[PDB]
Design a protein around this ligand. Structure first.
Ligand SMILES: [Zn+2]
Ligand SMILES: [Zn+2]
Lengths: 266, 488, 321
């Protein structure tokens, strides 16, 4: 009942690629974590990967790395390198063999850098993936000057949208309109123009840009302003034929109802 | 005699000296107010940035034992009763029922011994042992706790939810209304005069209890593997007549007898000094202190300074003990322990408190505690799994009678197998015959072969060879021939 | 394979399905789902899971593996619904601003709470779901669902960035009138009763056990009751008839009643041949529910129009209009 003896012969079992007698070993040395890892690895349709997993639980990381390389499971070796914290051999494994977890590897490395207070490298490796639009606004929270500098620098037409949403929910209507106009989010332009009461320039924006959502919202505002004819016309422009025909039925514009109903959905 | 100095050095506000009308008997300061008073009168001043201006000099029925200020509300304790009122009592569409109230109710024949005032609550302890929360915003009692003995003193934390109270027996407790429980403070000195909570935003659990001789630094471990508890972290001697006022990031602004504040650095928080000149033999106790205070970031910094793998393992074990999965993942990833990093990332998204507690207890090789936590979780069978993974077949059989009875046969057979390999054939026979099923033909045949071998080795040779005949497997005959050769 | 080597992996899946392939396509799409869930792109994860369900249903046309994989179709459809719902909750608790209405967040959080399994799928943290449910129920006026949410939150490990708000809300919620606003009470439509905002049975009624029908955009009990067909009625016959003029017991309609019904208040949901069509009767024919011809998800008509105009595609399955 000596734990060192069991550990030694478990390492020997690693050397011999036999795990059935190993599986009953690292439950006798008190290594519950390793037994659980073996149980989880049993689902793999391979034998080299399972022995590599057992080696990882026994230490001997070089043997497990070589066995993963021999197994050709480059995804498992990538995860092994990430877990080991090398973060550079994992990058090369992703760039050479995975090619599908490459963006996932970039995201995980950037998260590791962020946890290590390396904000700039985290920004760079978020940029290497498509997730920076999602991550940098979260990652630069409570750092609004840096966040607006990054938003102005990148010009991603969605970082502008995110910043404009923030400014709108920060009492910054003018800057919100500026950034929405940069982001070409015509729906927000029309919405805030109607909300502020200046409906004419909203109508001009809808007419010029042709944004379907902007025209729909503007015509909804018209239908809420008791004006119907313009509301019907700008439902027609926004291809919102259902609201248009409902309004025509309400106001009894049968002649206007026909032209909308003919081209409407069945 | 007639001066009160109000300052916020942490936020950089310059000290402001206010000359009051009379020599105050009690002084209290809130976010926006300063109430100084004596006997049954209390003067309120609004602490404007440039200068102050007294609003009112209010009258109270009894001798104002104490007063508390916060937000726009003031609660004055006098004659065993707390009057809670507004300060800028503007009669402008303001409901009368929320402008002033008296505690306790007229029917309650109890006296208020201690009262406090947080940003949201009016907390007070009565001579009957009752601690009651009173949500000011909604004007309703939200918590009623009944301590066995009267609560002499209460000190809420800056978060305003968790409290520390001292009763008649000088027994300090930490009270949490969220889970509604009291955890006794260990080594609470009988003659402790006051308690100051930590104000640094990232030291939630830390607080200190001071008397005229020492300042004891305690830490409340809200989330640990072994349940919530209070742990004494250290002690720091303080000079004569130094009543502490403020505690910020381990620095104590304590009031002297000259009306001048002074700064004292706590022994537990003595690491705020330079760390490059400090030797490793001095960092190791410093690292233990930082680990005890749940200061994991500073512990990481000082471990990086040490560059000793034992220190990193100490930090990581502390992180696992305190239910900090992400930081433990960080520390193990830096160390290089791949297997445990992957195991942690497997449970990274676990939300059940007891299940995660059991997982992190098993990761630290405490299987009894891990099982005890697993049974209380929402996935009890996990315990069986680890007991099955630890080859603890007796314990696995004990658990499987409740959680998974369908695994009762298989596990039992495995038990017998171990009993067979340990030479304890008597119990091996019993568990083999107890491991029989009615569906798995191969399992039943294996169990029957085991029963045959055991019965043969029991000297019950007739029955053993009887089951030997009725098993369709030549390998059983092959090994049974050797067994009979053993009995010759 | 050329697209895979060129990193057009979503295009690679599109190609693998366009050509003949049912082994590399499924594994690459599973890897795409794992990448999405590993990141925070939960709407993308839901879309990928929906395509997994659609592929499993399509290649279940083979009778050899029909039974073992229609279950996969159902599982992936349910995961798609869960992830598409949870994307909004994930966005709400991370962005400094709010995009959805408080009513929508309340409904989504309630639907996730009821439909989320005991073993929560990967990435879905139910602490955020319960926290959002508590906040929205407190705001909208359901001061009894908030109490339940806080009681459940007391039994879960709370991230350090949620502890203050949750452990203060658990305290300040005891001051509320202890009542659920009638404007939020779900209303079963077969037996016109009022169900509790929390149902132990899930998203199911109390008196009867008709399952609820939720709008896929802003979750809401649609005025739809699922009815089945008699054993001996075919779907084409069903449509032809329609065009003319404890112990859950399904409302199995007859041929004569189908002759009485009209196409203006029945949603047929024409599943592929491996599955029979699911018929829904609208008890409020004045209002209109629209279906996406793919994914068959049901939205309020005005909400569907607005979302398609804003997006250019179905919010659920990004098919171009
Ligand atoms: Zn019903
Ligand atoms: Zn769709």
């Amino acid at each position: 009942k000596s734990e060192a003896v069991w550990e030694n012969m478990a390492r020997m079992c690693v050397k011999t690629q036999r795990l059935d007698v190993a599986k009953v070993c690292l439950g006798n040395m008190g290594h519950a974590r390793g037994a659980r890892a073996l149980r989880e690895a049993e689902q793999e349709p391979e034998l080299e990967a399972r022995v590599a997993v057992l080696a990882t639980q026994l230490g001997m990381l070089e043997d497990a790395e070589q066995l993963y390389r021999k197994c050709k499971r480059h995804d498992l070796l990538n995860k092994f390198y990430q877990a080991a914290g090398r973060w550079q051999e994992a990058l090369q494994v992703a760039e050479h063999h995975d090619r599908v977890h490459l963006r996932s590897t970039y995201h995980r490395y950037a998260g590791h850098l962020e946890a290590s207070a390396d904000c700039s490298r985290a920004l760079s490796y978020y940029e290497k993936s498509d997730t920076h639009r999602f991550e940098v606004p979260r990652m630069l929270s409570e750092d609004l000057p840096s966040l607006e500098l990054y938003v102005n620098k990148m010009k991603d037409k969605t970082l502008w949208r995110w910043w404009a949403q923030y400014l709108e929910s920060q009492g910054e209507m003018d800057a919100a309109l500026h950034y929405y106009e940069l982001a070409r989010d015509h729906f927000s332009l029309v919405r805030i123009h109607c909300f502020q009461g200046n409906v004419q320039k909203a109508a001009q924006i809808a007419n010029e840009t042709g944004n379907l959502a902007a025209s729909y919202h503007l015509a909804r505002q018209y239908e809420s302003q008791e004006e119907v004819g313009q509301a019907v016309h700008f439902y027609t422009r926004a291809q919102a034929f259902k609201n248009a025909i409902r309004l025509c039925k309400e106001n009894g514009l049968d002649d206007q109802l026909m032209n909308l109903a003919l081209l409407s959905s069945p | 005699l007639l001066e009160v100095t109000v300052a916020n050095p942490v936020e950089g506000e310059l000290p402001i000296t206010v000359s009051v009308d009379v020599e105050p008997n009690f002084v209290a300061v809130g976010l926006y107010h300063l109430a100084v008073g004596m006997n049954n009168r209390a003067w309120f001043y609004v602490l404007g940035e440039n200068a102050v201006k007294k609003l009112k000099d209010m009258e109270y029925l009894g001798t104002v034992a104490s007063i508390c200020l916060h937000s726009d509300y003031a609660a004055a304790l006098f004659e065993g009763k707390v009057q809670l009122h507004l300060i800028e009592s503007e009669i402008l569409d303001a409901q009368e029922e929320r402008e002033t109230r008296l505690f306790p109710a007229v029917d309650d024949k109890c006296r208020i011994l201690c009262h406090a005032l947080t940003s949201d609550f009016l907390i007070y302890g009565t001579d009957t042992g009752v601690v009651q929360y009173f949500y000011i915003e909604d004007w309703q009692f939200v918590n009623d706790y009944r301590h066995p003995v009267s609560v002499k003193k209460i000190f809420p934390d800056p978060n305003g939810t968790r409290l520390v109270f001292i009763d008649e027996k000088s027994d300090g407790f930490v009270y949490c209304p969220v889970n509604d429980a009291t955890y006794e403070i260990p080594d609470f000195s009988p003659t402790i005069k006051g308690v100051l909570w930590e104000n640094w935003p990232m030291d939630k659990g830390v607080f200190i209890a001071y008397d005229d001789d020492k300042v004891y630094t305690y830490v409340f471990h809200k989330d640990t593997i072994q349940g919530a508890k209070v742990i004494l972290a250290g002690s720091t001697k303080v000079p004569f007549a130094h009543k502490p006022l403020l505690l910020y990031n381990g620095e104590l602004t304590c009031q002297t007898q000259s009306g001048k504040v002074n700064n004292i650095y706590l022994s537990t928080h003595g690491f705020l000094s330079n760390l490059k000149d400090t030797g490793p033999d001095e960092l190791r106790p410093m690292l233990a202190q930082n680990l005890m205070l749940k200061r994991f970031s500073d512990a990481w910094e000082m471990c990086r300074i040490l560059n000793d793998e034992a220190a990193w393992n100490e930090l990581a074990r502390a992180c696992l003990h305190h239910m900090e999965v992400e930081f433990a993942i960080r520390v193990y990833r830096r160390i290089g322990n791949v297997g445990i990093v992957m195991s942690l990332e497997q449970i990274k998204g676990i939300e059940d408190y007891n299940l995660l507690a059991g997982h992190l207890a098993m990761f630290t090789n405490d299987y009894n505690l891990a099982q005890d936590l697993y049974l209380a979780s929402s996935c009890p069978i996990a315990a069986l799994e680890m007991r099955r993974d630890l080859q603890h077949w007796d314990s696995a059989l004990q658990l499987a009678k409740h959680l998974a009875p369908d695994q009762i046969p298989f596990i039992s057979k495995e038990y017998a197998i171990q009993l067979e390999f340990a030479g304890d054939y008597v119990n091996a026979l019993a568990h083999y015959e107890k491991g029989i099923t009615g569906d798995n033909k191969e399992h039943d045949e294996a169990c029957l072969a085991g029963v045959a071998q055991m019965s043969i080795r029991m000297g019950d040779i007739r029955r053993g060879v009887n089951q030997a005949l009725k098993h369709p497997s030549r390998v059983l005959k092959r090994d049974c021939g050797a067994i009979l050769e053993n009995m010759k | 394979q050329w697209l895979a080597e060129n990193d057009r992996f979503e295009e690679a899946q599109k190609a693998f399905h366009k050509a003949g392939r049912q082994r590399e396509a499924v594994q690459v799409l599973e890897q795409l789902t794992n990448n999405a869930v590993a990141e925070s792109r939960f709407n993308d994860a839901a879309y990928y899971y929906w395509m997994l369900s659609m592929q499993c249903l399509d290649i279940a046309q083979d009778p050899a593996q029909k039974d073992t994989m229609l279950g996969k179709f159902y599982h992936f459809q349910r995961l798609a619904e869960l992830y598409h719902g949870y994307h909004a909750i994930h966005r709400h608790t991370e962005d400094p601003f709010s995009v959805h209405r408080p009513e929508t967040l309340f409904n989504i959080s309630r639907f996730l709470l009821h439909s989320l399994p005991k073993d929560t799928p990967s990435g879905i943290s139910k602490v955020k779901i319960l926290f959002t449910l508590a906040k929205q129920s407190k705001a909208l006026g359901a001061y009894r669902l908030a109490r339940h949410a806080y009681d459940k939150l007391r039994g879960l490990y709370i991230p350090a960035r949620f502890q203050k708000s949750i452990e203060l809300g658990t305290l300040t919620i005891r001051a509320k009138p202890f009542h659920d606003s009638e404007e939020l009470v779900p209303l079963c439509y077969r037996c016109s009763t009022n169900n509790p905002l929390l149902n132990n049975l899930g998203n199911v009624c109390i008196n009867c056990r008709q399952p609820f029908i939720f709008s896929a955009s802003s979750y809401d009990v649609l005025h739809l009751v699922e009815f089945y067909l008699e054993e001996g009625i075919t779907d084409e016959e069903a449509i032809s008839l329609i065009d003319l003029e404890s112990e859950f017991v399904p409302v199995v309609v007859s041929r004569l009643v189908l002759r009485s019904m009209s196409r203006r208040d029945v949603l047929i949901k024409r599943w592929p041949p491996p599955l029979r069509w699911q018929y829904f009767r609208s008890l409020l024919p004045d209002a209109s529910i629209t279906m996406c011809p793919s994914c068959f998800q049901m939205f309020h008509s005005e909400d569907y129009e607005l979302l398609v105009l804003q997006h250019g595609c179905c919010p659920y399955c990004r098919r171009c209009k």
